Structures are given as C-alpha cells and as structure tokens.
A paper describes a structure:
In siphophage T5, the unique RBP is located at the extremity of a central fiber. FhuA, an outer membrane E. coli iron-ferrichrome transporter, is the bacterial receptor recognized by T5 (25). We present the structures of T5 tail tip, determined by cryo–electron microscopy before and after interaction with its E. coli receptor, FhuA, reconstituted into nanodisc. These structures bring out the important conformational changes undergone by T5 tail tip upon infection, which include bending of T5 central fiber on the side of the tail tip, tail anchoring to the membrane, tail tube opening, and formation of a transmembrane channel.
After two TTPpb6 trimeric rings, the tube continues with a p140 trimer and then a DTPpb9 hexamer. A BHPpb3 trimer closes the tube and forms the beginning of the central fiber that continues with a pb4 trimer. The p140 trimeric ring is surrounded by a p132 dodecamer that forms the collar, onto which are grafted three LTFpb1. The proximal region of the central fiber is made of three strings of five consecutive FNIIIs, two at BHPpb3 C terminus and three at pb4 N terminus. After a hinge region, the three pb4 monomers merge to form a 110-Å-long β helix spike, formed of a 24 β strand longitudinal mixed β sheet prism. The central fiber ends with RBPpb5, but this part of the map is poorly resolved and did not allow building an atomic model of this protein. This 310-Å-long central fiber bears two hinges, one between pb4 last FNIII and the spike and the other at the spike-RBPpb5 interface: It introduces some controlled flexibility to this otherwise rigid assembly and may ease RBPpb5 exploring space and encountering its bacterial receptor. The tube lumen is filled with TMPpb2. Three TMPpb2C copies are coiled in a superhelix, burying hydrophobic residues in its center, interacting closely with BHPpb3 plug. BHPpb3 closed conformation would be stabilized in a metastable state by the assembly process and interaction with its tip partners, TMPpb2C in particular.
Author numbering:
A (entry chain i): 626 to 688
B (entry chain h): 345 to 464, 626 to 688
C (entry chain j): 345 to 464
Amino acid sequence: AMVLHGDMIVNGTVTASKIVANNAFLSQIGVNIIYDRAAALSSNPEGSYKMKIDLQNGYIHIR
Amino acid sequence: KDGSTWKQTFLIDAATGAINIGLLDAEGKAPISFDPVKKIVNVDGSVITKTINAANFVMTNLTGQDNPAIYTQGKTWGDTKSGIWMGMDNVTAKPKLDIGNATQYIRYDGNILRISSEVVAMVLHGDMIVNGTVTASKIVANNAFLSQIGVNIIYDRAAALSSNPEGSYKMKIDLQNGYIHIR
Amino acid sequence: KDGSTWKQTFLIDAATGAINIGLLDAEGKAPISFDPVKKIVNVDGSVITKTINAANFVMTNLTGQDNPAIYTQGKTWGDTKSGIWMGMDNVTAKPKLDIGNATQYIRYDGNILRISSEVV
C-alpha cells in the first residue's frame, strides 16, 4: 500500500517481515548466518549453497 | 400588473387546492408553487442556511434510479474531471466516490478503493507486525535486526552503493559454484 | 396583535408583489418572505429532512466567490481546528478538503493530497 511520487527521508521506523529488491545502497548492515539466494530464493534457504560464513561460532564451512 | 403582461405571483384556487408562489417558468408550476392534490412539497434554493436537524442525505422518489448521494452535479464515478461524488450510489447499490482528478486523486466504490497516490507512502506512528506480505524492489537502511536471510552472491556496498555493484570489491563469496575469489 | 407591538407575520402587497411570511428581522425581509420582483426564492431551515432529489452541492450567485462546497461554517483549508471542508473550492478553481486536526488528519487540494498519518 505504498505508491510513490517522491523521495522519502523516513522520520519514523521502517519495519517489515520480508524483502525483495534489485539492489540496496545501504549504510550499515546485519546478516547473522550467511546463506545465499543461491539457496534462499531457491527452495530451502538451507539448500544448495557452497560456503556458509556464520560469524557466531567460528564457522567457515567451505564446499 | 405590468405592460400587457399580467405577471401573477401568488395564487390559491378553490378548484384543485393549488397553492402558487413566485413567477412561473414551468408549464403549470412555479419554483415554490404547491399542489396538495397529488400531494407534493416543492421548493428550491436557500440564500441563508446555517442549520439543519436531519441529514438531508438520502435521495428518494426512485428507490433505485435516484441514487442516495450528495455530489457535484454533472460528474460522477468514472469522469476525468476533478469534481467530486459522494453518498450511497444505487446503480451499484453501495457508495461510489471520487475526489480529485483521474491521476492524482482518491477513488472508492462501496466494496473497494483505489488511491493511486503517495504520502510523506508509509508514515509511521506505531509498530507493525505485518499480517500480509512485505514485498519491494529496492531497500536502503541503517541496520536490520532480521530473523533469516538470503544473499545469492556476496557483493559489497563497497561496490553496491559504489558505482557498478560488480565494481571495487576484494572477495566475492558466491555460494553457488564453489566460488571463493580473494583479492 | 400584541401590546403596542403590531407584530405582523403574513403579507401580500399589490404594489410590489411582495409575499412575506414569518416575523421580520431583516430591514425589509423575513426568513421565508419573498420578492418575485427582482425575483428571489429565499428560505432557510428544515426541521425534518429525509429526502432530496438533486445533489444540492454547488454554490452559485457568485461564479468565483461563492465556492461550490459543503463544509463546516467557520473553517476551511488551512485552519488548525479539527473541523471539515469539502466540495469544489473556486478560489483555487478545484476541490479543497480537510478532515481532522492539523497533525493527525487528511488534507487534500484539487491537484494533490497530504495525509501525514499511518495505518496498520
């Protein structure tokens, strides 16, 4: 329900439950456990990937 | 009396109970003339109106084809003009409405609405547990306290916000073909 | 008749076609008095109204400075009050509108709108 005719400097909080886009010129990030859309958009986001860099427990799994 | 024109204004006739006031323009009627026979209360216009007591909202004398409505005469739901229309339309049995032009406006029908316009179009005064689907085409933010992720081929905003998201980066971890390129 | 005040209500004069009803408050007029000479249909107020047939929407007798509009008397587009205003404003030639206060409301002008509010 957001039809856009201008540029938004949001003075509130931009929350959400899902996100699809083509790119993102962001400022600072957060990604707990590196899946990929090689698996995410693909079925089972824990599906076909080659290396999942989880920064929580010294986890560099290389495939 | 006037010239050869016996202009008559007030009348009461003991033949049909007709009660007439004001000059005549109709074939046998005047703006505020009356006819208790086949009773009808006919009036029009009010220079001063500072009050009502009931709504004066519905339209009747035709249950279906006098649609209850307060609207701009000469414009309705589907006109390119920037006029207005409100009330309970009865050709659809439920309210029609349109405020503004045909591109930057608010349209409504008794069942659904069409507001093809923005606002500064998500202004937020509360916290959202979205019960729908939050889709999008682009995203810019300062951080994200997410739950689960997806990132096909690890670029960086060292390249993404920078020109050519395939631009200046140092290691692109694509999880699709055993691709760890280190620079 | 009353006291030394000959309060007159109904009248018809064969000098100017004047048709008068009700007590007088104006200089030479009454709420539902009439004057077919320089014709005018003047009335006001209706205790019972359960019907209309045409909109009763436009405002005329001044093409530009009687703006076609149904609105709260004493408030319009740009007032901090929480009143309302609707219709085809003619000082801008197109509809003005505002429902609610000056912070949590919906504003509109014939061309554009300003709804500085949320929804869930």
